Amino acid sequence: PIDDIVKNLLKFVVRGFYGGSFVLVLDAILFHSVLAEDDLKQLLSINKTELGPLIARLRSDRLISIHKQREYPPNSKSVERVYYYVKYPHAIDAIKWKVHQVVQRLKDDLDKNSEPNG
DNA sequence: AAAAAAAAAAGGCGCGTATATAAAAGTTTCAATGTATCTATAAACCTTTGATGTGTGTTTGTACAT
Fold first, then answer.
1. Which of A30, A42, A47 is closest to A85 using CA atoms?
2. Second label for A111, Cα 20 to 30 Å away, from A17, A36, A46, A80?
3. Contact, A91 vs A58, CB < 8 A?
4. Helical residues (DSSP H) of A17-110, grouped into ranges
């Protein structure tokens, strides 16, 4: 549905004005909403400084609200995983405002213009 | 008293002191990367100990032979 477009649109921006690797964490956790954190790390098989700053954007854009996918461990102890429960509405909401802001960095800039007065 | 082996002793071989020329080969040293190994630490359990509704309990009022 538009939900695919929502994910589609997320890919575009995360690849339009973002680097290529930005969408890799998109698709990986887009495969399954409630995903174990290591699975993406395991399949990518990459370092934690090749994953940390990418995780930053996912929550810096709030696109991947990594839900604490708590599981029932067999040892009777703590169990959880960073399952990116995407907050589709809220993610774009800032984005639209984010977009607006750069336009303000042009809508204001229209007065910084052609013919010399100063 | 006589024979044999090592030291006393010096002068010099021959390139370290620069020393710059340049190519030719190679080393080591430095730093980013990767990994098992300490640790605390706060988050797992287990036990403890102070606060706690209440099952059982003292007065009220009872059908019920006695």
1. A30
2. A17
3. no
4. 22-30, 37-44, 52-60, 88-107
